[PDB]
Amino acid sequence: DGLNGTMMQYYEWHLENDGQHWNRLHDDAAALSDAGITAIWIPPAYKGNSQADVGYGAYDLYDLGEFNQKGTVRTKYGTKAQLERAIGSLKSNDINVYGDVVMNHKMGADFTEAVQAVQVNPTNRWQDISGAYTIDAWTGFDFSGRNNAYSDFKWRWFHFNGVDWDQRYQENHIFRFANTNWNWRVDEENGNYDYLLGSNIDFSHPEVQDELKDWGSWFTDELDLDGYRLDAIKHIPFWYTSDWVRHQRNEADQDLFVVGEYWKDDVGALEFYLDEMNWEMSLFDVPLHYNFYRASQQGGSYDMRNILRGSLVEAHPMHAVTFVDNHDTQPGESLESWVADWFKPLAYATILTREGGYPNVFYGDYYGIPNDNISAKKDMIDELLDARQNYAYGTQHDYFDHWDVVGWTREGSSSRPNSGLATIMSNGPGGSKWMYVGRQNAGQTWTDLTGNNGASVTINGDGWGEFFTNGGSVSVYVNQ
Numbered sequence: 001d002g003l004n005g006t007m008m009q010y011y012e013w014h015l016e017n018d019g020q021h022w023n024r025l026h027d028d029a030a031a032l033s034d035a036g037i038t039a040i041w042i043p044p045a046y047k048g049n050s051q052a053d054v055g056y057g058a059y060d061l062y063d064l065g066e067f068n069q070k071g072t073v074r075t076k077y078g079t080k081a082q083l084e085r086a087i088g089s090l091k092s093n094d095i096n097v098y099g100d101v102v103m104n105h106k107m108g109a110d111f112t113e114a115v116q117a118v119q120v121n122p123t124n125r126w127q128d129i130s131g132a133y134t135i136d137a138w139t140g141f142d143f144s145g146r147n148n149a150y151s152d153f154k155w156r157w158f159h160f161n162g163v164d165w166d167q168r169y170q171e172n173h174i175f176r177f178a179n180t181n182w183n184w185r186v187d188e189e190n191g192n193y194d195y196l197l198g199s200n201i202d203f204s205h206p207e208v209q210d211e212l213k214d215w216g217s218w219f220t221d222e223l224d225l226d227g228y229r230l231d232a233i234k235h236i237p238f239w240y241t242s243d244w245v246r247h248q249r250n251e252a253d254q255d256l257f258v259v260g261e262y263w264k265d266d267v268g269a270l271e272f273y274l275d276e277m278n279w280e281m282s283l284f285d286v287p288l289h290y291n292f293y294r295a296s297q298q299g300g301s302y303d304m305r306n307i308l309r310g311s312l313v314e315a316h317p318m319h320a321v322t323f324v325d326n327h328d329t330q331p332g333e334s335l336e337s338w339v340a341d342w343f344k345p346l347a348y349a350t351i352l353t354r355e356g357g358y359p360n361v362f363y364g365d366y367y368g369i370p371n372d373n374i375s376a377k378k379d380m381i382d383e384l385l386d387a388r389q390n391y392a393y394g395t396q397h398d399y400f401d402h403w404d405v406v407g408w409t410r411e412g413s414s415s416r417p418n419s420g421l422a423t424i425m426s427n428g429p430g431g432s433k434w435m436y437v438g439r440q441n442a443g444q445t446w447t448d449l450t451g452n453n454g455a456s457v458t459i460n461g462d463g464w465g466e467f468f469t470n471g472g473s474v475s476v477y478v479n480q
């Protein structure tokens with residue numbers, strides 16, 4: 001063992017709705033493992049509001065593309081049988097499977113129900129702006145085509161506490177069901193950020209807490225998951241997520257890795273949440289993503305010495321899942337903040353070659369995003385994955401000492417031959433920098449894995465070497 005861990009989000013928002021994705025994953029297993037991928041984060045695998053739903057408009061958590069509901073049997077990605085077949089391929093190829101879990105809300109309700117509600121202030125859900133009146137809310141779920149397979153639980157309006165659409169008078173408003181409280185504790189942006197979209201689940205009810213725990217365990221056992229990616233957890237009561245997590249680890253024999261999506265460009269907020277979780281999971285390093293974006297947007301003037309500053313990985317590398325972009329940050333999406341092609345290579349070297357953090361590769365970057373004419377960066381990434389997989393080991397030395405050129409090295413480890421590397425980059429004019437790589441690598445000649453620089457670096461007697469990088473580029477030297 002000892003091999004570094006590399007996660008990969010296997011999907012992008014504009015993937016084709018051809019129902020063959022699971023099959024593609026199945027066929028890609030061997031190649032992904034060989035490339036350096038050790039864990040695959042799959043998109044929500046259950047029936048959404050429609051066949052083409054990316055998965056977040058979650059309709060039925062027990063329908064993994066097995067029953068005819070919402071106008072389709074399969075999900076956008078494929079059928080339950082093809083999913084299971086894919087997971088089998090992943091497992092036999094030494095790849096962990098983390099399932100995306102959406103429990104904040106539900107959508108695609110089978111029918112509406114009359115509910116007493118009040119409109120609240122969009123920027124302050126604490127502030128009611130209307131008196132209580134009766135609206136028709138899409139809260140009724142009967143899961144017709146499933147026939148109570150796996151579970152006979154049915155959802156009704158009293159399991160929720162809000163919606164953003166009154167079907168009686170057909171109007172958009174943030175509604176809080178009268179005589180129900182907004183979950184707590186939850187992110188406080190907008191006062192109370194319990195409500196995001198769809199029909200918001202109220203976890204105050206015991207029957208709801210238990211249902212999602214049982215489902216969580218059913219799902220876990222059904223797919224033999226090795227962990228989860230928790231969707232929109234800042235909108236879900238902190239106390240419940242912890243309960244749920246502890247419950248799953250209790251029911252499952254296998255270990256379970258957990259990464260939560262707490263979307264906020266504020267590391268303090270993330271640390272607070274992790275505090276409440278008692279550090280029993282990691283979170284996506286959202287501030288680091290925005291640092292990459294801020295740098296991508298600004299240009300060379302951006303001071304590279306601050307690239308990791310304010311990042312979650314900087315403070316708690318053991319609890320940070322680092323990434324460059326995702327299905328929400330890609331162009332045109334809800335959390336759009338795309339890292340341009342010029343800077344993206346630097347961002348990836350940063351999360352794949354450094355020692356801290358559990359790095360995640362984005363499918364959209366790897367294979368490209370045809371919808372927006374974004375080329376596949378597979379070539380560039382595979383060289384960084386080769387570096388991480390075979391060379392990013394041993395003691396690390398940082399050099400964020402210049403506004404343009406920065407770098408770091410890894411001395412390597414006896415446990416893994418020829419390991420050791422020196423990453424150097426610049427977001428402006430090129431340059432060079434002497435860096436220590438371990439007197440034990442002395443007399444060695446290192447070359448750039450990325451091919452961005454032809455310089456051949458020989459390590460002197462004191463274990464030092466001068467490394468070169470061109471402008472707006474990044475190079476990763478290793479003893480190959």
Ligand code: NA
Binds near residue numbers: 194195235
């Ligand atoms: Na919520």
Ligand code: NA
Binds near residue numbers: 299301302304427
């Ligand atoms: Na700069």
